[PDB]
Swiss-Prot record:
It comes from Mycobacterium tuberculosis (strain ATCC 25618 / H37Rv). Induction: 6-fold repressed by starvation. The chain holds residues 147 to 243 of 1316 of the full protein. DNA-dependent RNA polymerase catalyzes the transcription of DNA into RNA using the four ribonucleoside triphosphates as substrates. Coiled coil: none annotated. Belongs to the RNA polymerase beta' chain family. This is DNA-directed RNA polymerase subunit beta'. The RNAP catalytic core consists of 2 alpha, 1 beta, 1 beta' and 1 omega subunit. When a sigma factor is associated with the core the holoenzyme is formed, which can initiate transcription.
């Protein structure tokens, strides 16, 4: 059953990655909109730098949350494939998964 299990896992990883890319494109377009809103209205390089740092921090947050979920799936899959008796699973959460 390794083939179909690996297929389902690959589709699930792809789902995580495509969701991340949708979120990041949305937030980057929102940062562009916010920066243009500052540009046309009253704004100096202070407010521009603040909004840019905030948008980039949120984009790091999205990327790193999706990356932690991808690494979660990675350890799930490698653990299942290399599973053997006498192996200890310390994380109760990973065992439930």
């Amino acid at each position: 059953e390794l083939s179909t299990l690996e297929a389902e896992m690959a589709v699930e990883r792809k789902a995580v990655e495509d969701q991340r890319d949708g979120e990041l494109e949305a937030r980057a377009q929102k940062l562009e909109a916010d920066l243009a809103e500052l540009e046309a209205e009253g704004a100096k390089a202070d407010a521009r730098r603040k909004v840019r740092d905030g948008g980039e921090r949120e984009m790091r947050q999205i990327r790193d949350r999706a990356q932690r979920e991808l690494d979660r799936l990675e350890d799930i899959w490698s653990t299942f494939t290399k599973l053997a008796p006498k192996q200890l699973i310390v994380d109760e959460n990973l065992y439930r998964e």
